Amino acid sequence: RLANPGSGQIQLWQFLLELLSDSANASCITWEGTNGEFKMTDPDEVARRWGERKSKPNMNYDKLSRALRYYYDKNIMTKVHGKRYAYKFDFHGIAQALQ
Amino acid sequence: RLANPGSGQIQLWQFLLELLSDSANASCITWEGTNGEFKMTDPDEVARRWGERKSKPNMNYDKLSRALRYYYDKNIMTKVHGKRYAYKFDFHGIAQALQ
Ligand code: NA
Ligand code: NA
Fold it and tell me: What does the alpha-carbon distance between residue B43 and residue A26 come to, in Å, rounded to a whole number?
């Protein structure tokens, strides 16, 4: 489900796209260059920023990683094996989420 | 630039995602399965539907193909070489277009 940009009601998948849209955020999250893949260069900073957006006290990587795993069975995202803090958007699921 | 779903003001890239979001449209446009790639199984029907949405008289594949080529230099889409009516979304450009 699509939210207004920069909104507190935003879902995690859209928030990550928002961070990736601005190259200035590369010290915490960056595109890998192929097929919707990205890397959290600073996963604790990504979790901190997610906590700030959702005003969720005690947001941390443990909780963020649980939230990302929820997307595996929803065709929104998968974990990329053999890399550090690497994930891949599923744009087949996100195309529906736009509707 | 993101438009309201199903709107007449929609841009071509978003309209194609709208058609791809519904498997019922596979007789004219379908996902290939990898990396944002899709195939127009009926390019004349895709052009007809685009013409109907934009109420553009004499919309045809020639004009649609010109419109798609415009996206090559904008990091929105490329043509997929060695396939029939195959294109690939660039989700790096589309992530910005969401903002
Ligand atoms: Na946003
Ligand atoms: Na739409």
Answer: 39
Q: In angstroms, what is the resolution?
A: 1.7
CATH number for the domain including B25?
A: 1.10.10.10
Q: Write the CB contacts of B74 (distance below 8 Å, at least 6 apart in sequence).
A: B93
Q: How far is B83 from chain A (nearest CA, A)?
A: 18
Distance CA B40, CA B47 (A): 10
B95 to A20: CB separation less than 8 angstroms, yes or no? yes
Whether B25 and B19 have beta carbons less than 8 Å apart is answered as yes
Q: How many domains does chain B have?
A: 1
Contacts of A91 in chain B (CB under 8 A): 36, 89, 91
Strand extents, DSSP E, chain B: 30-31, 37-39, 77-79, 86-89
Which residue range is the domain that position B87 belongs to? 12-97
- What was the experiment behind these coordinates? X-ray
Q: Do B95 and A35 touch (CB under 8 A)?
A: no
